[PDB]
Each structure stands twice: as C-alpha cells, then as structure tokens.
Amino acid sequence: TPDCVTGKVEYTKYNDDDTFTVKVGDKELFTNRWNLQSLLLSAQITGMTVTIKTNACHNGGGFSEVIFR
Amino acid sequence: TPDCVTGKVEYTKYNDDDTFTVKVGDKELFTNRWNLQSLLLSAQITGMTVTIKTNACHNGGGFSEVIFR
Amino acid sequence: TPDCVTGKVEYTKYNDDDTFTVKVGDKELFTNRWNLQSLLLSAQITGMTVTIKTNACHNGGGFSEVIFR
Amino acid sequence: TPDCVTGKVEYTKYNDDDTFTVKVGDKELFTNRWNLQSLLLSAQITGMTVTIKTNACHNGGGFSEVIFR
Amino acid sequence: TPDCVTGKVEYTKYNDDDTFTVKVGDKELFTNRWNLQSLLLSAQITGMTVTIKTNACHNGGGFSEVIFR
Numbered sequence: 163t164p165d166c167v168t169g170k171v172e173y174t175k176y177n178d179d180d181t182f183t184v185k186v187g188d189k190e191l192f193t194n195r196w197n198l199q200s201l202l203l204s205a206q207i208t209g210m211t212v213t214i215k216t217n218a219c220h221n222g223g224g225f226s227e228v229i230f231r
Numbered sequence: 232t233p234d235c236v237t238g239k240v241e242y243t244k245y246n247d248d249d250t251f252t253v254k255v256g257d258k259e260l261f262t263n264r265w266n267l268q269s270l271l272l273s274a275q276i277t278g279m280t281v282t283i284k285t286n287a288c289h290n291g292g293g294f295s296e297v298i299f300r
Numbered sequence: 301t302p303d304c305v306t307g308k309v310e311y312t313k314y315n316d317d318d319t320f321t322v323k324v325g326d327k328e329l330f331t332n333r334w335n336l337q338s339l340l341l342s343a344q345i346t347g348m349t350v351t352i353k354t355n356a357c358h359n360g361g362g363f364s365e366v367i368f369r
Numbered sequence: 370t371p372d373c374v375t376g377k378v379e380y381t382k383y384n385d386d387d388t389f390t391v392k393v394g395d396k397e398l399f400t401n402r403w404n405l406q407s408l409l410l411s412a413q414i415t416g417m418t419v420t421i422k423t424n425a426c427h428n429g430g431g432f433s434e435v436i437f438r
Numbered sequence: 439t440p441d442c443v444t445g446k447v448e449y450t451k452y453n454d455d456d457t458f459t460v461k462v463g464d465k466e467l468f469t470n471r472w473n474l475q476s477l478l479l480s481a482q483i484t485g486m487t488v489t490i491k492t493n494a495c496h497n498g499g500g501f502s503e504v505i506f507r
C-alpha cells in the first residue's frame with residue numbers, strides 16, 4: 163500500500179460512530195480498527211513519528227496501516 | 232456537532248452504571264462509550280487540552296466526540 | 301453515594317476470582333468492575349488522589365464509584 | 370493464600386498458548402489470567418515491588434493473586 | 439523454541455489484516471496475537487530489550503514467544 167503522510171500526530175478525535183480520526187501532516191484521515199485507538203494516542207503523547215499507508219490519501223480518507231518510529 | 236467546552240480535564244469519575252463523567256471548563260458531562268475511559272484518564276494524567284463536541288452542552292449532558300490536543 | 305476515603309493508592313491486589321482490591325487511607329476495599337483495574341493501577345503509578353464513594357465503608361467492603369483528581 | 374515471592378520483576382515472557390510467565394525473586398511462575406499481562410508489564414517497566422501469593426510456590430507453578438506496592 | 443533475535447525494537451507496524459509487525463535486530467517478523475500489540479509498543483516506547491523465539495527465523499516469519507527485560 164503506498165505511503166500517504168509521515169509526521170507527528172497533531173491531534174486525534176473520537177467520533178460518534180466509534181471510529182477514530184488522526185491529523186498527520188496536512189491530511190485528516192480516520193480508521194475503524196478499535197485496536198489502533200490507544201496505539202495512536204500513545205504515539206501522540208510520546209511524540210513518535212508515524213507513516214500512514216493508504217490508497218485513499220485525501221481528507222476524510224480511511225486507513226488501517228500505520229508504521230510507528 | 233458544535234463545540235461545547237475546551238480545557239484541561241479537571242477530574243474524571245467512574246459511575247455505578249459503568250458510564251464515565253468528566254469535568255472540563257465549567258461543565259460536568261458523561262459518556263457511555265467504554266473506549267473513551269482510558270483515553271480520557273491518559274489525557275487527564277498528561278495534561279492534554281480536550282474539546283468536547285455535543286448538543287447537550289449543560290451539566291449532566293452526554294457526549295461521544297472528543298478532540299485531543 | 302457517600303464519600304468513604306480520599307488519599308493516594310497505597311497498594312492494589314489482583315484476586316483469585318478476578319476482582320481487584322485497593323488500599324486507600326485506612327480502608328481496604330474491592331471492586332468487581334474489570335474496567336477499573338487499569339484505571340486504578342495508572343492512578344497508583346502516577347500518584348493521583350482518589351475518592352471512593354460507597355455505602356459499605358469498612359474493610360472488605362465493595363465499591364464501584366471512584367473520582368480521580 | 371500464602372505469600373510465595375516478593376521482589377522486582379526480573380523479566381516477563383509471552384508464551385505460545387497465551388499464558389504469561391514472570392520471574393520474581395528466585396521463582397519463575399505463570400498465570401493464565403489475560404487481565405494480568407499489561408498490569409505485570411507496567412509493574413516491570415516502572416520498577417514496582419510485587420508479592421505473588423500461590424500454593425504452587427515452585428518453578429513452573431501457576432498463580433493468580435499479585436499485590437502491587 | 440530457539441532464540442531468533444535479541445535487541446531493542448527499531449519500529450512496529452499495524453497491518454491491514456490486524457496482525458502486527460516488529461523489527462528487532464536484522465529481522466522483520468509478525469505476530470497474529472492481539473494481546474502482544476500494546477505490550478510490544480510499550481517495550482518500544484520505554485527502550486526494553488526483547489528476545490523473540492521462533493522457528494521461522496527469517497524476514498516475514500511469524501512468532502508468538504517474546505521475553506521482555
């Protein structure tokens with residue numbers, strides 16, 4: 163799956179339908195995998211750099227693949 | 232959904248029916264989403280600023296949307 | 301529900317029937333809510349002050365309401 | 370249930386059947402309770418002192434009761 | 439099961455089928471056990487040394503046994 167954005171997590175958002183939104187770089191993306199919610203908030207809190215891989219690389223796009231550096 | 236309060240978490244409370252109460256700004260609100268309980272206690276412990284979005288913006292109102300900054 | 305003890309968590313214990321015991325102040329109390337186990341060990345590790353509310357305010361009493369400050 | 374060992378966690382191990390092994394003091398013991406896995410890794414990472422209570426107090430013995438000081 | 443790599447976690451990756459990849463030493467390996475995902479990210483964030491035991495000791499190989507010191 164192609165890389166889409168790499169950067170620190172600027173903010174995260176819990177959504178009304180239990181999906182989770184993340185802003186990394188200049189894109190706002192969401193995931194429906196509940197396992198990723200605490201992993202991404204820990205990355206945010208400790209300042210890790212994440213790379214999100216997705217074909218829907220646009221605002222509002224979904225993802226499931228994340229690399230944590 | 233409109234913004235209702237933005238601030239640091241002042242305290243959290245675990246309720247008898249397994250919902251979770253939070254006091255942010257001047258409002259005391261609750262959520263029934265179990266996934267938000269450890270995310271909001273981590274935001275409290277590390278001093279993050281949260282924005283709660285809800286139409287029930289009054290004491291005792293419920294919410295499910297939270298932004299973590 | 302009335303306040304029973306306020307203080308820092310002295311120790312926590314995992315019990316043979318999957319309940320969790322906590323010692324706050326001068327009372328040792330237990331809860332059967334599994335969601336409270338990691339929230340109380342985080343409060344212990346980061347030194348938060350907790351208030352437990354319960355009518356069974358005696359050693360061995362149960363509880364479910366906790367305020368985290 | 371009698372005390373068996375008290376000390377800091379030397380290492381933890383994830384086992385092929387999803388049980389979890391811990392070495393505290395001079396004993397290596399395991400638990401089948403999935404709730405204890407992140408509680409024991411947090412105790413190892415932050416250097417807490419744990420007391421394990423079990424009648425199978427020998428290498429390879431199982432336990433479920435742990436006190437976190 | 440034989441030791442395969444020992445080292446600090448260099449990166450972790452959440453995969454599209456909910457498995458989790460880890461790079462330790464010179465090998466990139468994956469596990470399908472959901473319980474290991476937050477244990478390995480905590481090991482990565484706090485700089486623990488992990489030993490992965492597996493017979494598939496090659497890039498792309500799977501594992502389930504991890505020692506955390």
Ligand SMILES: OC[C@H]1O[C@H](O[C@@H]2[C@H](O)[C@@H](O)[C@H](O[C@H]3[C@H](O)[C@@H](O)[C@H](O)O[C@@H]3CO)O[C@@H]2CO)[C@H](O)[C@@H](O)[C@H]1O
Binds near residue numbers: 193215
């Ligand atoms: O978290 C939501 C969602 O994330 C991942 O899917 C993403 C989009 O939501 C999904 O619509 C998109 O599907 C593409 C296929 O990748 C592509 O092969 C096909 O040609 O078109 C469809 C529709 O546009 O894929 C992205 C991820 O690349 C995740 O895969 C999905 O299971 C779900 O978790």
Ligand SMILES: OC[C@H]1O[C@H](O[C@@H]2[C@H](O)[C@@H](O)[C@H](O[C@H]3[C@H](O)[C@@H](O)[C@H](O)O[C@@H]3CO)O[C@@H]2CO)[C@H](O)[C@@H](O)[C@H]1O
Binds near residue numbers: 244
């Ligand atoms: O906001 C603080 C408040 O949160 C919790 O109460 C929630 C609502 O605020 C409250 O309106 C709601 O009341 C329920 C009662 O639980 C129920 O017994 C009764 O029959 O119906 C009313 C609504 O008409 O309760 C929710 C919780 O689900 C929290 O319980 C409360 O102590 C306080 O912290």
Ligand SMILES: OC[C@H]1O[C@H](O[C@@H]2[C@H](O)[C@@H](O)[C@H](O[C@H]3[C@H](O)[C@@H](O)[C@H](O)O[C@@H]3CO)O[C@@H]2CO)[C@H](O)[C@@H](O)[C@H]1O
Binds near residue numbers: 178263285286293294
């Ligand atoms: O955790 C409780 C609850 O949070 C969210 O709902 C909030 C209030 O609890 C709910 O009463 C309120 O309902 C609104 C409708 O959204 C609005 O369309 C209608 O016009 O008025 C009612 C009453 O004010 O909505 C807020 C959130 O905006 C969450 O949606 C819900 O599932 C539940 O988790």
Ligand SMILES: OC[C@H]1O[C@H](O[C@@H]2[C@H](O)[C@@H](O)[C@H](O[C@H]3[C@H](O)[C@@H](O)[C@H](O)O[C@@H]3CO)O[C@@H]2CO)[C@H](O)[C@@H](O)[C@H]1O
Binds near residue numbers: 332
């Ligand atoms: O803290 C949330 C929750 O804690 C207690 O429930 C625990 C689990 O959260 C709950 O899913 C679990 O349910 C069991 C059934 O009791 C059992 O009959 C069935 O076979 O399996 C499910 C899943 O393992 O029960 C434990 C407590 O034993 C608490 O009871 C519950 O009300 C709520 O507070």
Ligand SMILES: OC[C@H]1O[C@H](O[C@@H]2[C@H](O)[C@@H](O)[C@H](O[C@H]3[C@H](O)[C@@H](O)[C@H](O)O[C@@H]3CO)O[C@@H]2CO)[C@H](O)[C@@H](O)[C@H]1O
Binds near residue numbers: 247331353361362
């Ligand atoms: O975690 C165990 C238990 O904690 C909470 O209940 C507590 C005691 O376990 C329970 O026996 C006690 O019951 C009270 C009633 O609240 C009171 O109205 C009646 O007059 O007397 C009995 C005995 O004193 O209540 C406390 C909490 O106040 C929790 O409510 C329960 O679900 C369970 O989790």
Ligand SMILES: OC[C@H]1O[C@H](O[C@@H]2[C@H](O)[C@@H](O)[C@H](O[C@H]3[C@H](O)[C@@H](O)[C@H](O)O[C@@H]3CO)O[C@@H]2CO)[C@H](O)[C@@H](O)[C@H]1O
Binds near residue numbers: 399400402431432433
């Ligand atoms: O996590 C594994 C296991 O831990 C707890 O049980 C322990 C041993 O696994 C179990 O064999 C041992 O059984 C004892 C009885 O306690 C004792 O009453 C009887 O006389 O002898 C047997 C054999 O030694 O008990 C220990 C804990 O004392 C836990 O109870 C069990 O559910 C399971 O989690």
Ligand SMILES: OC[C@H]1O[C@H](O[C@@H]2[C@H](O)[C@@H](O)[C@H](O[C@H]3[C@H](O)[C@@H](O)[C@H](O)O[C@@H]3CO)O[C@@H]2CO)[C@H](O)[C@@H](O)[C@H]1O
Binds near residue numbers: 386388399
């Ligand atoms: O020294 C702790 C030990 O924990 C793990 O092994 C546990 C017991 O110590 C071990 O005796 C037990 O072995 C069982 C198998 O579970 C069972 O499937 C097989 O048929 O019989 C043997 C002997 O009764 O397994 C438990 C774990 O469930 C761990 O495997 C070991 O490396 C070591 O850490």
Ligand SMILES: OC[C@H]1O[C@H](O[C@@H]2[C@H](O)[C@@H](O)[C@H](O[C@H]3[C@H](O)[C@@H](O)[C@H](O)O[C@@H]3CO)O[C@@H]2CO)[C@H](O)[C@@H](O)[C@H]1O
Binds near residue numbers: 470
């Ligand atoms: O998470 C993936 C997987 O990890 C563990 O299995 C590993 C490989 O996935 C599996 O192919 C490999 O199988 C070995 C046999 O154990 C061995 O007896 C035989 O000689 O060779 C095959 C192929 O190399 O085993 C490794 C771990 O050693 C885990 O056991 C499995 O349940 C699953 O979690």
Ligand SMILES: OC[C@H]1O[C@H](O[C@@H]2[C@H](O)[C@@H](O)[C@H](O)O[C@@H]2CO)[C@H](O)[C@@H](O)[C@H]1O
Binds near residue numbers: 197456
């Ligand atoms: O990330 C793990 C799973 O997350 C989502 O499922 C959640 C929850 O984990 C599951 O128990 C429940 O049945 O559905 C939830 C979403 O409605 C994904 O939808 C799953 O496919 C898993 O990836």
Ligand SMILES: OC[C@H]1O[C@H](O[C@@H]2[C@H](O)[C@@H](O)[C@H](O)O[C@@H]2CO)[C@H](O)[C@@H](O)[C@H]1O
Binds near residue numbers: 183191
């Ligand atoms: O821009 C990111 C948004 O993510 C969530 O919405 C997505 C998606 O954008 C939307 O079209 C879809 O219907 O629902 C998804 C969530 O389930 C949030 O709900 C939005 O607030 C944005 O953060």
Ligand SMILES: OC[C@H]1O[C@H](O[C@@H]2[C@H](O)[C@@H](O)[C@H](O)O[C@@H]2CO)[C@H](O)[C@@H](O)[C@H]1O
Binds near residue numbers: 180263265266267
């Ligand atoms: O956040 C997870 C879900 O919370 C609420 O459900 C919880 C719990 O997760 C569920 O497994 C249980 O059966 O009921 C609980 C509520 O009584 C919400 O109802 C869900 O929408 C999820 O958000």
Ligand SMILES: OC[C@H]1O[C@H](O[C@@H]2[C@H](O)[C@@H](O)[C@H](O)O[C@@H]2CO)[C@H](O)[C@@H](O)[C@H]1O
Binds near residue numbers: 401404405
């Ligand atoms: O600690 C939680 C429970 O652990 C064991 O069960 C786990 C898991 O929690 C359960 O949902 C799954 O179906 O089986 C697992 C392996 O047995 C214990 O058997 C339970 O008593 C709980 O302690």
Ligand SMILES: OC[C@H]1O[C@H](O[C@@H]2[C@H](O)[C@@H](O)[C@H](O)O[C@@H]2CO)[C@H](O)[C@@H](O)[C@H]1O
Binds near residue numbers: 387456470471472473
């Ligand atoms: O974490 C141990 C187990 O992980 C995998 O199962 C997960 C999850 O734990 C389970 O609750 C869910 O129903 O299915 C998931 C797999 O898609 C393993 O497959 C299990 O065998 C356990 O090892």
Ligand SMILES: OC[C@H]1O[C@@H](O)[C@H](O)[C@@H](O)[C@H]1O
Binds near residue numbers: 313321359360
């Ligand atoms: O006060 C709560 C008590 O709960 C019991 O189940 C346990 O055996 C005691 O050791 C104590 O923890």
Ligand SMILES: OC[C@H]1O[C@@H](O)[C@H](O)[C@@H](O)[C@H]1O
Binds near residue numbers: 454467497498
């Ligand atoms: O080399 C291990 C590989 O494991 C696969 O399951 C995963 O999809 C790949 O991205 C890679 O991590």
